[PDB]
Design a protein around this nucleic acid. Sequence first.
RNA 1: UCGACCAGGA
DNA 2: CTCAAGTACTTTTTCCGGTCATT
Lengths: 1426, 107, 134, 30, 277
Amino acid sequence: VGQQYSSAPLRTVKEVQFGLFSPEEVRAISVAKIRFPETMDETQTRAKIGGLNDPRLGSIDRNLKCQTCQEGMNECPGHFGHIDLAKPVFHVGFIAKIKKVCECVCMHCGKLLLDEHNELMRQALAIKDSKKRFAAIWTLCKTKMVCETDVPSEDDPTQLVSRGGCGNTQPTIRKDGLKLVGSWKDEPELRVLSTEEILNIFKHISVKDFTSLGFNEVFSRPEWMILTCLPVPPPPVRPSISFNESQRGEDDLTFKLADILKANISLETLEHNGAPHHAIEEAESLLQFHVATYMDNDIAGQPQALQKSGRPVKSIRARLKGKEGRIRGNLMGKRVDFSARTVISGDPNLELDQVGVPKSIAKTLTYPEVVTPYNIDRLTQLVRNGPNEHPGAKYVIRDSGDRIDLRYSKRAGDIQLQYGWKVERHIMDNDPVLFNRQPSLHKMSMMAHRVKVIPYSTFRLNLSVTSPYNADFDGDEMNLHVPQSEETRAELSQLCAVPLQIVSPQSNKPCMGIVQDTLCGIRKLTLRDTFIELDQVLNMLYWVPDWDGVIPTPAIIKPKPLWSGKQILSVAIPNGIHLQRFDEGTTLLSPKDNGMLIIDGQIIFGVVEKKTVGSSNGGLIHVVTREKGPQVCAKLFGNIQKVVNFWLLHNGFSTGIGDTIADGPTMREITETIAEAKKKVLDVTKEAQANLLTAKHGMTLRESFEDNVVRFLNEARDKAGRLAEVNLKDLNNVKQMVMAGSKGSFINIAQMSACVGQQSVEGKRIAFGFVDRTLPHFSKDDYSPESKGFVENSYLRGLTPQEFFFHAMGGREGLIDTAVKTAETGYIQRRLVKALEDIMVHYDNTTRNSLGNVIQFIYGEDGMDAAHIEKQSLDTIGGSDAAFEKRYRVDLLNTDHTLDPSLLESGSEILGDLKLQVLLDEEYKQLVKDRKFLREVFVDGEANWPLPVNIRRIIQNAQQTFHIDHTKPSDLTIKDIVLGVKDLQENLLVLRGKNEIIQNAQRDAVTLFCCLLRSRLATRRVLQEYRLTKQAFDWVLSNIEAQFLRSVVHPGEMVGVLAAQSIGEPATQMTLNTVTSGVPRLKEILNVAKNMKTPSLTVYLEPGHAADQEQAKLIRSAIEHTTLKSVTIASEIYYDPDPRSTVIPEDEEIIQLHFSLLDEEAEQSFDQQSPWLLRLELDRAAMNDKDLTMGQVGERIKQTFKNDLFVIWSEDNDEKLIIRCRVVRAEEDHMLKKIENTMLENITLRGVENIERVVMMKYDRKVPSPTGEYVKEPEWVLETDGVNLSEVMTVPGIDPTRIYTNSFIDIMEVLGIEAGRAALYKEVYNVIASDGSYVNYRHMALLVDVMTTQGGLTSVTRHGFNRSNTGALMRCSFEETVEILFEAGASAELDDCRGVSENVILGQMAPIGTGAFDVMIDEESLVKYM
Amino acid sequence: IFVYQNNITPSAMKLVPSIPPATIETFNEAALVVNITHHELVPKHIRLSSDEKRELLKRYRLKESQLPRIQRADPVALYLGLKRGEVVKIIRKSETSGRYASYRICM
Amino acid sequence: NQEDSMIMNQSSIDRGLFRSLFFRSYMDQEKKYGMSITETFEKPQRTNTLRMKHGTYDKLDDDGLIAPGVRVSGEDVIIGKTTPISSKRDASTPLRSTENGIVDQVLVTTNQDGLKFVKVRVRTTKIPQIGDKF
Amino acid sequence: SFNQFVDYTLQDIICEDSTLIISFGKIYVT
Amino acid sequence: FDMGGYFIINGSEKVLIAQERSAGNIVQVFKKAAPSPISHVAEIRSALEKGSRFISTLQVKLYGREGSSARTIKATLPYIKQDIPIVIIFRALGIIPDGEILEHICYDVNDWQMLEMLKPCVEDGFVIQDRETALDFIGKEKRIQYAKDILQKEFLPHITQLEGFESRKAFFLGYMINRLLLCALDRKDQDDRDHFGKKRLDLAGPLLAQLFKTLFKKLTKDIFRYMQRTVELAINAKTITSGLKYALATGNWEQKKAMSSRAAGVSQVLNRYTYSS
RNA sequence: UCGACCAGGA
DNA sequence: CTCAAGTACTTTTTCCGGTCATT
Ligand SMILES: Nc1ncnc2c1ncn2[C@@H]1O[C@H](COP(=O)(O)CP(=O)(O)OP(=O)(O)O)[C@@H](O)[C@H]1O
Ligand SMILES: [Mg+2]
Ligand SMILES: [Zn+2]
Ligand SMILES: [Zn+2]
């Protein structure tokens, strides 16, 4: 690391002070004067020229010789030089900020165009934020086109007060390439502002003024944005590529500098010599170009500064620009040593936590072990074994610090190992290693494993750890990393180890269970028909490495002593494991061998398959991991495998074409099921051709028809499929795999055996790519199943050529979507990760980012670690109010409702105890309180929620532990129970704080768990149900406290990253495997996309009208926006010169009932009017359906145009519906055509603007009954095809306490940022729940909380999160890299070095998890421990 | 509080900060037809006293910046005539804790 | 054979099941440096410069080319070539590190511009091992 | 495709633009 | 068993990969997005079968949307910045009375729906009533000859580039305008850009034809250059020889030098693991 | 010993 | 002197042999 001892003190970077280089500094920092464009070759001599590329700088040719600094190559960093430019030139990056500063200060005296006098200016100056203050000041001064001498005084505006002198008009500055041009002023003066001009103006900008702008007096003055003295980077930055002796070869950056130096030398000669004045501007602009082009070459203005080759030239900007760029490609991720990768293979004879390391690999990788008296003797035998034997070593590292290559060293045979030396030795069995499989979208994608050195070239790995990596053995490769420290080893073995990773916190369930062969065979082994004879049973038992040595008593003894499959499987299941299931008709005597019952680690009934032995929530793995431990579970995995795998090896399993073959009569049955459905289609087709069909809202007759086709043909495939599944015997190997849940599903059977079904591309059935026909083998206008891709055939039967091609199109759609949406999903993670990185739990249980700003006050609102959470019911929520009272009420003052003296000893003397009834009254009163609270929180009555401490399991154990006989009465007192639970609660601590804000925060975090606690430990429930002895109760009470405490989050928990991967991985998988929703809507949400694709607005009806369908119809009509355009057939312009009489005989009866009655001043206003008449016919159906009257319509036009248009109209009864219009008061022809445009497209007839196609819905609703119990109470709800929350909320007859929109942006503007969070979470949650997938609240809660805390909707884009007050180095690590860094210097940013990213760039132990605290030695204790 | 029908002159509306220490608040009738605070998704926001606030920042060891912010323009902040720097204690209901309370500093 | 993998008959593998033949052709040319400053094909040793390969040169003949019978293996030198300057810098092409085998066929010809052109083929037999895809 | 080029297209290119202030004739292919 | 159909370049088996391009001289109407000042567009990829290979594409646009008062039809002509109304083009081609111009677009005078859509376009063009006044409305005498030349050389260069075929181009223009208003009325369906019949493949021959033309023209420019320098043989074979050789070796087609602009992986080293590969 | 294209793997 | 539209800019999943030119 940099090599050789240095006396200088070793420190860690704690702050990064960004600024700009002042010319003065550039000169002082410089070691060489750099004046010759020639690198080296002091005319032929292969030695460097004292003028560029070491005119003193760094070094070449591996010569310690480096300007007396000695050291050379690995030791000496570079040494900077300089080059004094002939004229000042702009820095490419600051080109715009220079313009913006010119747009703020007077281009003559350098005084800010706006003063403390302007009131908006005072407000802008009041901004604390350096960048936001600059922004406001710019927007203000850009307008000011004159450096005012005098401005009106704060008192009277009548008397003016003088400020900074001089008048002068300010230019309107505009960019032209790399130049700045003004426009001062009939006709203006337009000239280019010189680099020198700008400079002397900037040099005149006062500290007060420029510090009022972004700038810093010490670190970044505005004048330093213009370049005078260029810093020359040393060779280590721009290395010379030597390709022999004679083959020189220099870097790109070396060429550009030489070119700047070439351009400079010209400009200087023109000046210092006969100045040709207009050739100087040419040579000046060339210098500007090169200096620009060297720092940035991907500039807007077309010249790419191409190297003569056709290559553009790598700018310095281009070097750092992300992924491959210095930040993302060299610092955020690196190529690493002590790494290995090979093909992976599955091994059932490996431990869950082992990894098979090929001897080749074990012999190359090395752990450097320190020569300690503990190892000294072993280590010598490894060194003496050398690098070729397996247990051996490659190098001996002396105290002196020098490597001994045992492969060559003449003393390799010798070496008398002194202590303190290091021996780099071959990896050995049981060394911790980090194993991973790319793409790494999980905490689990990288796990620590024990080594097992094996022969043959693959990494062998236990099959049940396949799922977390998502690895298959079809030629997958995996990466291995070898830790080098004894402390880094501990890191892996103590946090990253596989056994630890078993229960996953993203799902609050185990991420690994029993798979494939072992799962298929565990079902087979289990089922009641499976019996094992002695000879084999004994081998099965020996196979369990932890077998107690006890041959269990055979289930059957009678003639042959036989053992059950379940019986000897229970040998792998450890004692005290209690599990209860109940599936279909599971009845404590499950006739179907349904569900599951395991007591004391023994199977009582039911088959073992996926729902037990898999990675299920309530399944055996989550239970052993919780109750028995992580290493205990890691064993259970192996022991199930060792037995199941063995049994199956000797039982066998297969799959033939016979497994797809369905019965002969069953086949005819399937064939006629298709036939009856094709005849059902034909019917709906010829009926729709006969124009009789009626389309269901928001659909064409065509759209509505196509739904029915698709529906009949999908109903068909599924019932046809079901016939086959049903006809398949229990012996069907394919059925047997679907059964255990090892591989395959219903649809997999259906398509193979029965029929493939309908094919789809873009949601629709194969459409006409050719004209009105799917293929040239069809006649036009054929809509039949066969035509638009229906596969009537099974895979076993075989496909017709047309079916084959249609399936081929549908199949291709799958590969495209997997490819298209795989990057989109990936970028989504990168963004989610870069947004949440720095968020962790601090030792105060508060969730904060790198700025220490609170995101969550307590992790996931409860302070609980998601791994330690199981779904548990809340039996206080549901049921009738009666059943509740039965369940929990104890009334010692009523002879019928007391605790019977059969339940507790005190039962007899307890009756009438008014003091104890006082205790039991509060008890029940609180349970009733609880019920009301829970029904408040979960409005639907949902009682199954994930909570910590599985109370059921605790009671379940207490019974099997204390052999609880449900016969004899308990030793508990009312006081014992009531007061015991009260006291337990006080001990379930999350937050410790002795104040009242924290003690109230504590009280609050437990609120729900206590509801559950009191629910489960009521005096009645404890005594009557559980039948607990005092002894058992104290045990239950302690084990709740115990378990709760462990269940809380750990300060350091990288809660931020976790949450991002927890939302990320699902999305990335929900694509990889072959109304807006999924990846596109998730994109919408994260981007806080304004114009969203499906804006909708769910509108609930007034409480006293919920089921009144008629009330809904009224609102439906009252909100759906109707335009005249929608009810008009055609509009016509007629020349009817007399108004009183009409040329149109159809309009005879119209003028009659309108001129006679409407005699109300219509004579003089008007008896013409306009001879030009606009007449429009309306549709009866359009008018009727979208409920309207000619009178209604007519008056709207009459009030849109007021009295500038004379409107008349035909009556509703009339056979032709018409509206006649005339103007009121030269070229009136086109003047009237404009009136019809405003009439069709700009008039509202009914409803709310932005609201389209409103539909009714008969929604179900879980509502409590007056009896108590929740019941299905349907209601009417309307859904929109547009959004205007603003006005639809006000609409009468609706519930505005319920109204919702899928556009959370609108919710946050109408109901605030708090309601914004609610809506945002709701939408996020549903895009995840859309693909079935479960994410534990907390993660989505965190992402939602993050976007929100800021005060608004902060997008997970470069536009949103990446713009915050976080570290410069941290933000430049995502999306806008070089620019972020340029503005860092230009506004003198200071980086805390608190973020992860910063420490990772700095190569420092991040303040993350293991590094979230400090370690100290205490001398007090050092002398005490001896 | 001045409750207007359609609008107020830009001339008239630029007379609001003319009378300190006192403050003025403009509200459109149509906006006030519905009490947005009564909606499902809108939790209870509560104004903190100079001391309540002072104490919160002490007990959570916070700088004013470190607190989640409520915008001055925010519908609920407008309902409670929230002034720059005032803190609201937001009591919401949790599917996880039962009850969780946050805080928001004004903008 | 679990999860997309397979078991294979080793007894069948011996009898010649799925055996492969792998060939690789290594190519070289004598470089020319304008003023008749040409590289040469030769088995070099020490000499003034000393820039040379780790691997054994002892397999090469006097033409700096291995005969077609030899069994090559590590970083063994396959072609011995040298570049002088203003003298053993090296220009020799060693057998691909990972690889090993038997020299199959060696051809010595001339490039269109009169330079010594050499292609060397190295044959090996590939036995279906464990990580081997099928 | 190549045969079509060699036979026809090649003679076409050498004769469409061709002629300078020097003209081009029949194309030959060895 | 070796089938051939590839090249041996510097002792390397190179395969020329077929290139899928959209067919040319093909008349195609497409609809424009929601925020567009143009509702529909008629496009024609006019190119000479052999004769440089004309990159010029004519756009015939329908300005205004459905429900926008007075919809106008303009067309972008190569080397004249603005998109000029079709009536002016017709007058600049020779067809001067609006009704002979109508007869060029609508092939039936019992079709008022289409003709009503033409009425505003007739009004737009009405400012200019003569052929010379139309050629002038292509920005005097200088701008008139310039116009004359563009309509002959760059406007519809397939058909003919010759002279008097002004009528042929006018009927064609009208055919494009007919096919434009045809999808505007929703009588014809919008053209499919993915119909495989409206695509072409460029194999070994045409890819070489493109390459060769460029290289030959580059030697023609050297032959002319040597002629100028001859102030009183020289034909550098290398330009053709190495020119073709580089394109086929690099695969980076282009070939002029080359650079980044143009190319791909057109020429590829032929797969030989198995026969079928 | 430098990096660009092409072709591939899960 | 407001606000519609045109203008430009910046992103796009993760790891893992041959051939060309030229350094
Ligand atoms: N372009 C890509 N980018 C990232 N990962 C990829 C990838 N292609 C494949 N993978 C990885 O490989 C996994 C699945 O691909 P494959 O293993 O080739 C299919 P399979 O599991 O063998 O059979 P299947 O097709 O029945 O699923 C993915 O989940 C992913 O981890
Ligand atoms: Mg795989
Ligand atoms: Zn040095
Ligand atoms: Zn001034």
